[PDB]
Design a protein around this nucleic acid. Structure first.
Ligand code: MG
Ligand code: MG
Ligand code: MG
Ligand code: MG
Ligand code: MG
Ligand code: MG
Ligand code: MG
Ligand code: MG
Ligand code: MG
Ligand code: MG
Ligand code: MG
Ligand code: MG
Lengths: 159, 205, 170, 48, 50, 293
RNA sequence: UCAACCUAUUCUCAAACUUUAAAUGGGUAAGAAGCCCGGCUCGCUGGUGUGGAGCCGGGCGUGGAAUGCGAGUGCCUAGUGG
RNA sequence: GCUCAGGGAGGACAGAAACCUCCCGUGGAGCAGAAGGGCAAAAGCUCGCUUGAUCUUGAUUUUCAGUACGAAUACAGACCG
RNA sequence: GUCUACGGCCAUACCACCCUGAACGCGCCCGAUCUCGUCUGAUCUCGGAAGCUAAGCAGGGUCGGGCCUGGUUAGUACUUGGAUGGGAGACCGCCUGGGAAUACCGGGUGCUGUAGGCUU
């Protein structure tokens, strides 16, 4: 059986990247988190206070509490057959905002501005994102030259 | 009392080297790897012939040295004493294990280190010969006699490289004449156009 | 004419006496070079324990000082007037630093006391130049560049133009 | 009398037979665990 | 059936053997068909086929 | 020989410090413990009073940290003290107090809390710290930032601290480091601190040298002699400085000049020029060798 | 000369080595519980009707990827654990 | 407040190795231990002052049945360094 | 064009050597009475301005090492899925998709926020 330590098997997980050791940069401290900000977890070995458990490295949750040095977030952990939306308390530097919510917020304010525009004009814009359609019909100009002939080059055992 | 090589012939386990963890490995049998007139510059052996392999198998250290001796004997009777350069391009690092019986059985089953093998990919060179341009059939016959000391099926290929160098034989003399290659014994050193040009003027003076 | 901020000036003269024992021998050697310099010394402890020397770890076995400025120049001129203003060539470090070692401190002009005895001294003078405070100050620590360092030959020609000394090779 | 020791074989089909049900999504989840000084402040702000 | 393929077949509404369904093509749908693709034969039908 | 320490492997696995830590100007340990707002405070600024004492003037700024940089709100330098009446001597404890006071009164006039929060109108030297009064808007609190001065007793950093404290900034501090706190008996007399604030150590040393020997006096204090500051000038000169600072604190900017755009540095050599110069080096070396042969 | 050394080169490796570093895969999101305004409360935070949070009040529906399908929830419970 | 292992060059007895100095020195040292992570104006070494190794209710993580004990993480109320 | 004070991202900024720096600065520098601290005013602290770009630092150079970023290596190695494919095996080929890394060869060598100077 394996051991059941809190940090077992995290040799390459909580270690810093190559040539990014040293002092933590201070933007990661100066960022501010409201409640309901969608937040990634990425644990870090330069600090040990407030470590997210190795079940949560990479997982993304939602902030339900912000404190003086740490936030409390609500992440989904899957254990054997169920999913638990559970509360953890993570210090501020194991954490980034998720841009997955920010791209949606950009698209919402863009859809709302071009809904409040082109309602007075009368035209009907498209707001859903249809997926990448098949390529429509198009001519290919072979301007001048014949296409280049290819053939498989014969086997030479170069080893 | 060594087990026959058909036991430890396939690349079965994770590569398991003689290290801090597997200590007490008995000494590998092959230890001389390069011989012949190995103190000879690359201007005077143009031909290179490789015993290349064709099976993803494990060659043993004893088979490597038996093949070394079988090539060496034939080339010292054929191409004089010091008119060649043999080098075995495999060094055995994988150590293999032996669970010996004599009554426990299989409880506590993990082998003592027995011997040392080399794991060989498809197209990985086993032995390689550096000779002159008219001792080509002697190279072919030497590696053909050395195939029968190895398990599995090996091929023989005369290469387009100038000896034991990574540069092509039709371009070697042109490059060394225009001073991009500098002889230093068994090999040759390449000269880029990236250095400080004090080395450039030192070459061209 | 040369730029007056490249003057070869001594930065410190550090002296020591390694007695190899503790107690009375060491404390009277401390009294020796306090009597020499005019400032109290510091006892240098031993890092290791090596029983072929008879010293053990953290045992006080040396006495040293560092003197500056004018007092350094007077002590240095007394050491060169005991060795006749004549030094070997190997006495010069690659960084231009030099130094030597004298046999008994009576020769400097220190009056003898039988409660004191005699001790050999080791003089070591590190030179400088205006600007070597850069590598030692706190707030913006930098190095000192290549044109401003002290080479071995430009230090020994300083020696034999400022003390008019004789260096002998070997 | 040895036996098989650990297995997670039929566990996947056992889980997805009733389905991996994602957690209960509700507006207005609770407030226990929130910073109690902030929760004092919130209760006075509701009280007045 | 591998369970990923069973789920994509349940979304394509091919349950029994030798059923058929029209499917319009886009980037989501071609990847959905290609996860299934040892289990289906899918083509570009004529107007007579429709 | 010796094995080369600074080889390819050394330079490729070498990790730098930060830029400001390479130049040594900032201490990131103290900077992180000093500027980082509590995360429940939620974008509320955390103000600092930076004191940096140079060789020839004293820079006192206030600063709160954002992600883009450090926003400075107010700035006060020692080299604008001739506007207020300190002619020269810009890097002593007295000018440190004056620029701390100037920083405080200039910031409070920028925020419009100048009639409120006078602080010590007259300076005493003992402990003070301004209390925020009720109904009127609260006092400005900023925390002191000394950087890399070894914060021992009598530091001009703490001179500028007492300047901002008597100006009306509510900087938390204790009177252990002001000049006057004797380390043996552990008290803090105010009149010795007041002598250091009014520069009476300098005036007493001025009278000391002009009694002892005049040559070292003229070598030591020379711009005082050019600007005719006798030791009897000193205390009322700093009092007039404190009065002028407290009754006209706002800063006048110098107007922008039409710059003629002359290039003082050699611009970056281009690729065509550098491969052309190495072509010329190779051609010139070959022709010099073949005409020497 | 033969050595260690040192400097560029070269042959072969690593489950418990690594600068690089895939495929498969793991979370989150793809709106009405969302946006945008107007305003009150707080003993928390506070240069600052500051910051945050909570409460009212109003206006916004193109239901904001594809595809498929009616869903959520509560008892009691056998058998199983070679 | 200082920089470590190691190496180079000097220096009375002194040496392969005691001590003093200069220079290079991205951690090649140290942090009690087994190893892995982590760390350079520190988490290392040396000082100064000390008892937050204290009183107290909750929440959460960790193995988990999502139960205990242990260990740990943000807080909160004092009393302090 | 440029610098100081505080910085952000932390080498496109580092490291070795060389050249050039007008004005303001930043420095080196001159001192130790007082504050302070040492074996030593070297450091730290404190009081200054006789001198100097010599160093720091700033800008620039090197067929520079490094780093960053492209090409090549290569649709190679590897790889999700498939066959009643091959082979005695080892392993290999094919279909459906995804797709790296050295060596080698080019390009780049700090951007920039807030406050305040200089270039009368
Ligand atoms: Mg096996
Ligand atoms: Mg069985
Ligand atoms: Mg069982
Ligand atoms: Mg500090
Ligand atoms: Mg039953
Ligand atoms: Mg510390
Ligand atoms: Mg001095
Ligand atoms: Mg200079
Ligand atoms: Mg210069
Ligand atoms: Mg380069
Ligand atoms: Mg700038
Ligand atoms: Mg003009």
């Amino acid at each position: 059986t394996n051991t059941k330590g809190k940090r077992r098997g995290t040799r390459y997980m909580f270690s810093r990247p190559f040539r990014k050791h040293g002092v933590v940069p201070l933007a990661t401290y100066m960022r501010i988190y409201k409640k309901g900000d969608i937040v990634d977890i990425k644990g870090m070995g330069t600090v040990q206070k407030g470590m997210p458990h190795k079940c949560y490295h990479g997982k993304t949750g939602r902030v339900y509490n912000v404190t003086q040095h740490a936030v409390g977030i609500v992440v989904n952990k899957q254990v054997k057959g169920k999913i638990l939306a559970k509360r953890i308390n993570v210090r501020i530097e194991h954490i980034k905002h998720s841009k997955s919510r920010d791209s949606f917020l950009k698209r919402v304010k863009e859809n709302d501005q071009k809904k409040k525009e082109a309602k007075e004009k009368g035209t009907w814009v498209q707001l859903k994102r249809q997926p990448a359609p098949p390529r429509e019909a198009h001519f290919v100009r072979t301007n001048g030259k014949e296409p280049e002939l290819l053939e498989p080059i014969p086997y030479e055992f170069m080893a | 009392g060594r087990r026959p090589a058909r036991c430890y012939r396939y690349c079965k386990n994770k590569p398991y080297p003689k290290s801090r963890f597997c200590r007490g490995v008995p000494d590998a049998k092959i230890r001389i790897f390069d011989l012949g007139r190995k103190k000879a510059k690359v201007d005077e052996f143009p031909l290179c012939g490789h015993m290349v392999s064709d099976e993803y198998e494990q060659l043993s250290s004893e088979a490597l040295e038996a093949a070394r001796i079988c090539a060496n004997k034939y080339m010292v009777k054929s191409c004089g004493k010091d008119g060649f350069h043999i080098r075995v391009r495999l060094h055995p690092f994988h150590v293999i294990r032996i669970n010996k019986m004599l009554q426990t059985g299989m409880r506590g089953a993990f082998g003592k280190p027995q011997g040392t093998v080399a794991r060989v990919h498809i197209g990985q060179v086993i032995m390689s010969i550096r000779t002159k341009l008219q001792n080509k059939e002697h190279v072919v016959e030497a590696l053909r006699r050395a195939k029968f000391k190895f398990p599995g099926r090996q091929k023989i290929h005369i290469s387009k490289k100038w000896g034991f160098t990574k540069f092509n034989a039709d371009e070697f003399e042109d490059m060394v004449a225009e001073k991009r290659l500098i002889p230093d014994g068994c090999g040759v050193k390449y000269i880029p156009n990236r250095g400080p040009l004090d080395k450039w003027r030192a070459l061209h003076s | 004419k040369e730029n007056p901020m490249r003057e070869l000036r001594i930065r410190k003269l550090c002296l020591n006496i390694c007695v190899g024992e503790s107690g009375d021998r060491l404390t009277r050697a401390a009294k020796v070079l306090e009597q020499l310099t005019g400032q109290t010394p510091v006892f240098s402890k031993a890092r290791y324990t090596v029983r072929s020397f008879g010293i053990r770890r953290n045992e006080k076995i040396a006495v040293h000082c560092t003197v500056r400025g004018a007092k350094a120049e007077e002590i240095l001129e007394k050491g060169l007037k005991v060795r006749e203003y004549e030094l070997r060539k190997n006495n010069f470090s690659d960084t231009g630093n030099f130094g030597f070692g004298i046999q008994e401190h009576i020769d400097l002009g220190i009056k003898y006391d039988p409660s004191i005895g005699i001790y050999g001294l080791d003089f070591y003078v590190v030179l400088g130049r205006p600007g070597f405070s850069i590598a030692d100050k706190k707030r913006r620590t930098g190095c000192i560049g290549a044109k401003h360092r002290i080479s071995k030959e430009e230090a020994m020609r300083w020696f034999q133009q400022k003390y008019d000394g004789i260096i002998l090779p070997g | 009398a040895k036996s098989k020791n650990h297995t997670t074989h039929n566990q996947s089909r056992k889980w997805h037979r009733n389905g991996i049900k994602k957690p209960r999504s509700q507006r207005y989840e609770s407030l226990k665990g929130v910073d109690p000084k902030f929760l004092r402040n919130m209760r006075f702000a509701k009280k007045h | 059936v591998s369970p990923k393929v069973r789920k994509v077949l349940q979304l394509l509404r091919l349950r029994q053997i030798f059923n058929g369904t029209f499917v319009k093509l886009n980037k989501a749908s071609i990847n959905m068909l290609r996860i299934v693709e040892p289990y289906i034969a899918w083509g570009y039908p004529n107007l007579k086929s429709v | 020989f010796v094995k080369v320490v600074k080889n390819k492997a050394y330079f490729k696995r070498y990790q730098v410090k930060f830029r400001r830590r390479r130049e040594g100007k900032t201490d990131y340990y103290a900077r992180k413990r000093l500027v980082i707002q509590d995360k429940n405070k939620y974008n509320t600024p955390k103000y600092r009073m930076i004191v940096r004492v140079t060789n020839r003037d004293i820079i006192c700024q206030i600063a709160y940290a954002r992600i883009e940089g450090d926003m400075i709100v107010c700035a006060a330098y020692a080299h604008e003290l001739p506007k207020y009446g300190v002619k020269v001597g810009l890097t002593n404890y007295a000018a440190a107090y004056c620029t701390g006071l100037l920083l405080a009164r200039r910031l409070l006039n920028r925020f419009g809390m100048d009639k409120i929060y006078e602080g010590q109108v007259e300076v005493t030297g003992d402990e003070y710290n301004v209390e925020s009064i009720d109904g009127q808007p609260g006092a400005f609190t900023c925390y002191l930032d000394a950087g890399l001065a070894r914060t021992t007793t009598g530091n001009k950093v703490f001179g500028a601290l007492k300047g901002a404290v008597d100006g009306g900034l509510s900087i938390p501090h204790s009177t252990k480091r002001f000049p006057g706190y004797d380390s043996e008996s552990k008290e803090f007399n105010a009149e010795v601190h007041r002598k250091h604030i009014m520069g009476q150590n300098v005036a007493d040393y001025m009278r000391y040298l002009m009694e002892e020997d005049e040559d070292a006096y003229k070598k030591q204090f020379s711009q005082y002699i050019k600007n005719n500051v006798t030791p009897d000038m000193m205390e009322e000169m700093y009092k007039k400085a404190h009065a002028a600072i407290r009754e006209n604190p706002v800063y006048e900017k110098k107007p922008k000049r039409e710059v003629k755009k002359k290039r003082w540095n050699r611009p970056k050599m281009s690729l065509a020029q550098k491969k052309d110069r190495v072509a010329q080096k190779k051609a010139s070396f070959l022709r010099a060798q073949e005409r020497a042969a």
